Structure formats: C-alpha cells, structure tokens
Amino acid sequence: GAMNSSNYAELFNNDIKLFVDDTNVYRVTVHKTFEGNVATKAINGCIFTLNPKTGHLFLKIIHTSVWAGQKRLSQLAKWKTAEEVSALVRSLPKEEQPKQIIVTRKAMLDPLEVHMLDFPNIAIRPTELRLPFSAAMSIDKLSDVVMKATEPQMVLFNIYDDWLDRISSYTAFSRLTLLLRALKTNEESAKMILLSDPTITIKSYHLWPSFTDEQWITIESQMRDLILTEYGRKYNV
Amino acid sequence: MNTVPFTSAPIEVTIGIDQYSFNVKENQPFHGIKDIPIGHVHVIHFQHADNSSMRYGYWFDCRMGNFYIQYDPKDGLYKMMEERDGAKFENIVHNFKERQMMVSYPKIDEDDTWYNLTEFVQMDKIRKIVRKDENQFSYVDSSMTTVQENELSDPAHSLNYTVINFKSREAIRPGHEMEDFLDKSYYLNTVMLQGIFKNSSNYFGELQFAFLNAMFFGNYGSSLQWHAMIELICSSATVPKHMLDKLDEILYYQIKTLPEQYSDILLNERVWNICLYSSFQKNSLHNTEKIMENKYPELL
Ligand SMILES: CCOc1cccc(B(O)O)c1
Numbered sequence: 001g002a003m004n005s006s007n008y009a010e011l012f013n014n015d016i017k018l019f020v021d022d023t024n025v026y027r028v029t030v031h032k033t034f035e036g037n038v039a040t041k042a043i044n045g046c047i048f049t050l051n052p053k054t055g056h057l058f059l060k061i062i063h064t065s066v067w068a069g070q071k072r073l074s075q076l077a078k079w080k081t082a083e084e085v086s087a088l089v090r091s092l093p094k095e096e097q098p099k100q101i102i103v104t105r106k107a108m109l110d111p112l113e114v115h116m117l118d119f120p121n122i123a124i125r126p127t128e129l130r131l132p133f134s135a136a137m138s139i140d141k142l143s144d145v146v147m148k149a150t151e152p153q154m155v156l157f158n159i160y161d162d163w164l165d166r167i168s169s170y171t172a173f174s175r176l177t178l179l180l181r182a183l184k185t186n187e188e189s190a191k192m193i194l195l196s197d198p199t200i201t202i203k204s205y206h207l208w209p210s211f212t213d214e215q216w217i218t219i220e221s222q223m224r225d226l227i228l229t230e231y232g233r234k235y236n237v
Numbered sequence: 238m239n240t241v242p243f244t245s246a247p248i249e250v251t252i253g254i255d256q257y258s259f260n261v262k263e264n265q266p267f268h269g270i271k272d273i274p275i276g277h278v279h280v281i282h283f284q285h286a287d288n289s290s291m292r293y294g295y296w297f298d299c300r301m302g303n304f305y306i307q308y309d310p311k312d313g314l315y316k317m318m319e320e321r322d323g324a325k326f327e328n329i330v331h332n333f334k335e336r337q338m339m340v341s342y343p344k345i346d347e348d349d350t351w352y353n354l355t356e357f358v359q360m361d362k363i364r365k366i367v368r369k370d371e372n373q374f375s376y377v378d379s380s381m382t383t384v385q386e387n388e389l390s391d392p393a394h395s396l397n398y399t400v401i402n403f404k405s406r407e408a409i410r411p412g413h414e415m416e417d418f419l420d421k422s423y424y425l426n427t428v429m430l431q432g433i434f435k436n437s438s439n440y441f442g443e444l445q446f447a448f449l450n451a452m453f454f455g456n457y458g459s460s461l462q463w464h465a466m467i468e469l470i471c472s473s474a475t476v477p478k479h480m481l482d483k484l485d486e487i488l489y490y491q492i493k494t495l496p497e498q499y500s501d502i503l504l505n506e507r508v509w510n511i512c513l514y515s516s517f518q519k520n521s522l523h524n525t526e527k528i529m530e531n532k533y534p535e536l537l
Contacts, residue, residue, distance in 0.1 A: 076415070117406050
C-alpha cells in the first residue's frame with residue numbers, strides 16, 4: 001500500500017522503483033490585467049521521475065504549448081503527468097521497467113493507475129513521507145534546462161552525481177532529501193552554504209559541488225542548522 | 238389471479254411475497270398465498286423464526302408453470318417445486334381455497350408499487366443471472382456472492398451480474414484515459430448499452446433486480462451492483478433523456494419502498510451524495526432528490 005517510515009529501506013532494495021513528483025508540471029505567474037482583473041501566465045515545467053536506488057532522474061520538460069487551448073489545467077496536469085510516465089515505462093526495456101511507482105501526491109494515484117492498466121503487475125503506491133522534490137527547480141542546472149526549452153523534451157540526469165562511488169544509496173538519498181529540504185525552506189541560505197567556498201566547484205557533468213567526505217559532513221551539518229533556524233524564525237523558538 | 242400453495246408450514250417462519258411480510262406460527266393451518274397478480278415477476282421469501290440467519294427465497298412467474306412450496310426437513314428449508322400434473326394442481330388449489338387455508342395477497346387497487354419496482358425485470362433475464370436451468374424459478378439468498386465478488390467461491394451458486402469496473406480496460410479507451418475516466422458515457426453507451434445489455438430496458442431490469450435482492454435478502458453484492466449501475470449513469474455526461482427520466486422514477490420508488498430502519502446498511506453515502514450533488518446528472522433526478530432529502534437527510 002502506502003510508503004512510510006516503517007518500510008523505508010524498501011526504497012534501496014533491488015526491485016526497480018520510481019518516485020513521481022508532479023508539483024512542478026503546471027507552473028504559473030499570477031498577475032493583473034489592464035482592466036484590473038487577475039490572469040495567469042504559464043511557464044515551462046517538468047515531471048520529476050527518480051529511481052532512488054540509482055539516482056537516475058528522468059526529467060520530462062513540460063513546455064507551455066501543451067496547455068494552449070486547454071481547460072481545467074490543474075486537473076489536466078495530473079493526467080498529462082500520468083500519460084508521460086506511462087510513455088516512459090513503455091519506452092524502457094522490460095528488464096528496466098519499474099515494479100512499483102510511488103507518487104508523492106495522492107491525487108496522482110487514479111490518473112497513473114488508469115494510464116497503467118496495461119501493466120497490471122506494476123504497483124502504484126502513495127507515500128506518507130513529505131518529500132521535498134518540489135525544490136528540484138532550485139538546482140540551477142535543472143531549472144536552466146527547463147526554462148530554456150522551446151519544445152517538449154526529456155533530459156536524463158544522475159541526481160547523486162558520483163556519490164554512489166563512496167556512499168550507499170540510503171545515505172545518498174538521505175543527503176539528497178536534506179539538501180532539497182533546505183533549498184525548500186530557505187533557498188538563498190541553502191545556496192550560500194553550497195557555493196560559499198569558490199575553491200569547491202561543480203563539475204560540468206555534475207549537479208552539486210565536488211565536496212570531500214569531510215566537507216559533506218560539514219555541509220550536511222550546516223543544512224541541518226538552517227532548517228532548525230527557519231523553524232525557529234517561523235515558529236519563534 | 239394465481240396461487241403459490243404450500244404442502245404445510247412445519248417451522249415458524251416470516252414469509253414474504255414482494256413488499257409484504259407476515260409471521261406463520263410453529264404448526265399453524267396454512268396452505269399458502271392466493272390472488273397473486275398475473276403479469277409481474279414475484280418473489281416469495283423466508284426468514285426462519287429460530288435462525289434469522291439466511292434470508293432466502295424464490296423468483297418466479299406464474300405464467301411459466303404451477304409452483305408450490307414444501308418444507309424439506311433434511312435441508313431445513315422451504316423449497317419451491319413445479320407441479321407438472323396440471324389437473325392435480327388445480328384440484329389441490331381449489332380444495333385449499335374452499336377451506337380458506339390461504340392468506341390473500343392484499344393488492345391495494347390504487348397501488349402500483351410492485352409494478353414500479355419490477356417494470357423492467359423479466360424472468361428470462363433473472364435466470365441468466367441466477368444459473369440453474371433445470372428450474373423455471375430462481376433461488377437467491379443472503380450469502381450468495383457475485384461473479385465480481387468472486388474475482389476479488391462456488392461458481393454455480395453465484396449471482397452473474399454484469400461486471401462493472403471503472404478502472405478496467407473495458408471502461409477506458411487507449412488514448413482517452415482522462416476523458417473516459419471523468420466522463421463514463423463511452424462505457425455506458427457503447428460498452429454496456431450497445432455492447433452488453435443491447436438496450437436500456439435490460440439495463441434497468443438488472444438494476445431493479447439487484448436492488449430487490451439487496452432489500453429482500455440483505456445480499457451485499459447485489460447492493461454493490463445496484464449502486465454501480467446508478468453511478469455509471471450519473472457519471473456519464475451523455476445519457477438519452479428518456480433514460481434519465483425513467484431512472485428518476487425507478488430510484489424514486491426504490492427509495493420510497495426501502496425500510497427506514499435499513500437505510501443505514503442499504504444506502505452508500507458516497508455514491509448518493511456524488512450522484513445527487515456532484516455528478517453530471519446532479520440536476521436530472523428531481524423526484525429522487527426530493528424523496529432522499531425529505532426521508533434520509535442524515536445520509537447527506
Ligand atoms: C400476502 C400476505 O400478506 C399479509 C398477511 C397478513 C398480514 C400482513 B402484513 O402487512 O404484515 C401481510
């Protein structure tokens with residue numbers, strides 16, 4: 001059924017699985033019209049589909065043209081997401097297809113289940129974890145490819161860079177979720193932490209800086225402090 | 238007018254015939270029910286005084302043979318049987334009526350209730366849902382499961398209702414996933430009505446039969462089927478106008494007849510609130526919405 005803290009190591013076993021986050025698919029700016037009404041303008045979005053064991057990220061860029069002339073866009077967005085996930089699965093060799101797909105929002109369950117009826121053996125599950133994948137667009141290289149896209153496009157990344165050479169998937173996922181939680185809580189402070197030291201750079205083929213093991217421990221601690229700070233500033237503690 | 242004669246009433250039992258129920262006492266002078274309206278299916282049902290477990294009964298149509306009831310002390314129930322000896326049957330029934338050994342089906346002449354509950358129900362279609370081709374009448378009870386229920390265990394003792402499942406490949410056209418899931422008209426009109434039922438009269442007949450098995454036997458799978466067939470219509474944006482008008486009448490009489498004390502277990506809150514207040518047809522069921530709001534406002 002649902003995925004929670006009790007069955008958390010399941011993410012890192014050898015059954016292929018994918019997380020799907022749709023929170024950045026339909027993105028708008030709200031603004032005033034010349035007549036003083038309010039209107040939205042869509043901007044490019046993305047589906048965030050992640051294998052938590054390998055770090056493989058299938059970033060499907062959602063170009064604003066897909067919304068043209070369509071109604072009820074927030075509902076369409078869930079069905080478009082499910083359509084694209086289903087297309088991705090069909091594109092993969094059978095031995096690479098996931099055995100489970102975990103959606104980060106329960107409103108994706110029925111859309112994905114319907115699109116995946118042809119795959120009765122693939123389990124579609126919710127999660128009680130509140131995962132910070134909405135902050136994927138605070139990773140500069142992912143945000144850049146989304147905003148520059150002029151047409152629908154899929155781009156593949158490893159969201160763990162080379163970390164798995166040195167740490168386990170469990171630890172790599174914990175790092176990722178801590179980094180994204182911090183970026184979600186205070187993007188500017190998080191980025192300052194990540195890029196303060198100009199001698200630590202981001203390789204052309206990476207998303208995150210080339211921290212040594214020691215430095216990652218320092219970084220990870222600083223990101224905890226930030227999350228604690230904002231929790232203090234927020235709740236006045 | 239036709240007659241369901243008994244051979245005798247050896248165990249105390251509540252007997253029902255359509256919407257009427259009466260008690261028969263441990264060894265009381267009882268040879269059956271007379272004056273049964275010809276032209277409708279009927280159901281004669283039983284609940285033993287000593288074990289209200291298992292309501293059970295028989296759907297039959299007197300135009301299809303001479304039927305009687307005889308208790309079986311081995312299987313412990315009242316069984317329906319056909320008499321092939323027509324002269325024997327008439328003699329027996331006559332003899333019985335002379336001695337006033339029968340209760341009277343009391344049809345108020347103003348009253349169209351049973352017609353309105355069974356308008357589309359046909360014995361031939363009942364016998365396809367209830368598979369026992371050697372008898373002209375059909376046995377149903379509280380515990381019989383449906384084909385769909387058996388998918389999710391004796392195939393011969395099951396109710397073969399038409400399986401309806403909104404997240405199924407039958408319900409959903411490849412490439413119309415959102416459209417077909419949010420608007421069930423394809424499933425209703427092409428798959429079910431044109432494809433499976435052939436016409437709305439057969440669809441309504443199964444719907445009415447499912448309701449009556451739910452109400453008279455507490456059959457849970459029948460209740461599921463009744464609600465699924467309602468939801469399929471109300472969840473379709475495109476429904477023939479005549480079907481919506483008839484559905485409103487059908488449901489009206491079903492809600493009117495439902496025992497108030499059973500509404501808690503026979504009415505699915507989610508289906509009814511969705512159908513009456515959120516669905517494509519939320520404003521097409523005027524009579525049904527009025528009786529539901531005045532009789533069962535708690536459910537809503
Ligand atoms: C068909 C036999 O109908 C009867 C006979 C006596 C009493 C009742 B009653 O309404 O509870 C019904």
